[PDB]
Amino acid sequence: NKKIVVIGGCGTVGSLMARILKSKGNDVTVSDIRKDTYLKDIFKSEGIKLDLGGHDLSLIKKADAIAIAPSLTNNKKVLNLINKNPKAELIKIEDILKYKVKKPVVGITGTNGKTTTREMLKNILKISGLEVPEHHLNITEFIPPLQARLPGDVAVVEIGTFGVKNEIKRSAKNSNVTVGVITNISRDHLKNISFQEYVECKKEITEVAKKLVLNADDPIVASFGNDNTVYYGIENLKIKIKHFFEDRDCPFCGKNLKYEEIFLGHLGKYECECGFKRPRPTVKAIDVENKKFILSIDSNEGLVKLEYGGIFNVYNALAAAAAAFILKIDFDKIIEGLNTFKKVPGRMEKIYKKPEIIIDYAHNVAGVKAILQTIKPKGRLIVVNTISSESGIKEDIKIAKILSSADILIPASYSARKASKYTNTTVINVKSTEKKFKKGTLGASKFQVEEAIKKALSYADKNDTILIIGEGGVKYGREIIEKIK
Numbered sequence: 387n388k389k390i391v392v393i394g395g396c397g398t399v400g401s402l403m404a405r406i407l408k409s410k411g412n413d414v415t416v417s418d419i420r421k422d423t424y425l426k427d428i429f430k431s432e433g434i435k436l437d438l439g440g441h442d443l444s445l446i447k448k449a450d451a452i453a454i455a456p457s458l459t460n461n462k463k464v465l466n467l468i469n470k471n472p473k474a475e476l477i478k479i480e481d482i483l484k485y486k487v488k489k490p491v492v493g494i495t496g497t498n499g500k501t502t503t504r505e506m507l508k509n510i511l512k513i514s515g516l517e518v519p520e521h522h523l524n525i526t527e528f529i530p531p532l533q534a535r536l537p538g539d540v541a542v543v544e545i546g547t548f549g550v551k552n553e554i555k556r557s558a559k560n561s562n563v564t565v566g567v568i569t570n571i572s573r574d575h576l577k578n579i580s581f582q583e584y585v586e587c588k589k590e591i592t593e594v595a596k597k598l599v600l601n602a603d604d605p606i607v608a609s610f611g612n613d614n615t616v617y618y619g620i621e622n623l624k625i626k627i628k629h630f631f632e633d634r635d636c637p638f639c640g641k642n643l644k645y646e647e648i649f650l651g652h653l654g655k656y657e658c659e660c661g662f663k664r665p666r667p668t669v670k671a672i673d674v675e676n677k678k679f680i681l682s683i684d685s686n687e688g689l690v691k692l693e694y695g696g697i698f699n700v701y702n703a704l705a706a707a708a709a710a711f712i713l714k715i716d717f718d719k720i721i722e723g724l725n726t727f728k729k730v731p732g733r734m735e736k737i738y739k740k741p742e743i744i745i746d747y748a749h750n751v752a753g754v755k756a757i758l759q760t761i762k763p764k765g766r767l768i769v770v771n772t773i774s775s776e777s778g779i780k781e782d783i784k785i786a787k788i789l790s791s792a793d794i795l796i797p798a799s800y801s802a803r804k805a806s807k808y809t810n811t812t813v814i815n816v817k818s819t820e821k822k823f824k825k826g827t828l829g830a831s832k833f834q835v836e837e838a839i840k841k842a843l844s845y846a847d848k849n850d851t852i853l854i855i856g857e858g859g860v861k862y863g864r865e866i867i868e869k870i871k
């Protein structure tokens with residue numbers, strides 16, 4: 387119970403440091419040269435007074451302890467101020483990291499589905515009366531460990547990697563992850579690195595998490611399994627779908643894996659002659675249909691009715707379910723959490739009726755495959771691709787080839803245009819994707835997405851579907867359509 391200043395306490399980490407210290411009972415006040423923060427609402431909500439547009443010397447001087455945001459650990463202007471109060475005690479992020487997390491921490495990792503799994507679980511937990519710490523940020527590595535140190539009952543955090551080694555591991559150990567979840571593994575973030583190296587990065591979660599929630603339908607994820615592992619998966623479909631199959635090699639002997647049934651891409655029921663076989667999942671999805679399936683866990687069975695449907699959403703729901711089960715959450719509550727879950731925007735979002743216009747965050751082969759498998763246009767399919775795969779041209783090409791099923795493909799980014807020359811469908815381009823004046827990757831712009839959408843509307847009938855995929859598309863689609871009305 388002391389007086390603490392948090393210089394640069396409006397930054398991503400500064401904010402969390404501030405809140406954490408405040409949650410231990412302290413006369414906390416944030417000091418920042420910046421005069422604007424979206425965090426004023428949550429700051430005032432938790433009893434953290436502000437001192438923006440410059441630092442109050444009296445504040446700093448009187449205060450007993452001062453916290454410094456990592457991004458300003460060695461800033462002359464800031465240290466010339468911290469040393470105006472030499473007898474005060476310093477609190478850098480390492481000190482806050484020393485703080486013990488005792489709350490159960492659920493860590494979610496994987497290629498796709500992390501966000502939806504995370505929010506589904508957050509819903510399940512919340513309606514069950516459990517406090518989950520929110521970082522309340524508009525954006526790293528220190529976010530997950532610090533978020534988990536915020537007050538609450540159970541922490542649910544995202545631990546991803548661009549493919550950088552020990553990222554997952556360091557952040558997971560620092561978050562004290564007790565329950566480790568892996569949604570799926572596929573090609574993404576492979577800019578310079580190998581797919582193999584990426585998989586090795588993902589395996590890191592299994593080096594810290596005591597318990598593991600693994601996808602049994604993903605051979606690579608499944609092979610990570612230990613003694614404290616709960617597996618989830620699909621046992622059967624009642625609907626017929628397009629496989630979009632992707633090969634997988636046996637992780638133990640290297641031979642190409644044989645599949646007896648396929649659900650989505652590389653997710654299915656597999657086996658190897660060496661003896662490796664898909665584990666029978668205890669958290670399963672029975673009689674899967676588009677927007678309805680029976681979730682079965684031990685002796686319990688409950689009908690899940692999802693708003694946004696699709697096999698990949700079934701998988702997200704299974705992972706969330708499995709995590710909750712590990713947490714001993716009542717079955718009916720797991721069901722309620724799933725059935726009342728509100729899907730995140732940008733996830734198969736309808737933003738126009740005739741023609742149908744959907745926007746979706748899909749940004750890799752697995753994402754495009756998932757939505758293409760789920761989407762069922764009654765009319766034609768016009769795709770507007772704003773994707774500029776972070777892996778590079780190789781996956782862009784793969785995505786374009788996948789997109790060949792589209793009646794029309796309209797590239798909305800430089801990368802997407804470049805890649806579309808290797809696809810076997812009708813390709814209609816726009817001038818904004820014609821010449822890149824600068825070097826290196828240049829993501830889809832508002833104007834490029836604008837031109838592409840207009841071209842799409844120009845070709846679409848009232849009964850057609852225009853699917854807008856990618857970051858740029860989700861980001862500018864609504865306003866482009868609204869300014870066009």
Ligand SMILES: [Zn+2]
Pocket residue numbers: 636637638639640641658659660661662
């Ligand atoms: Zn094998």
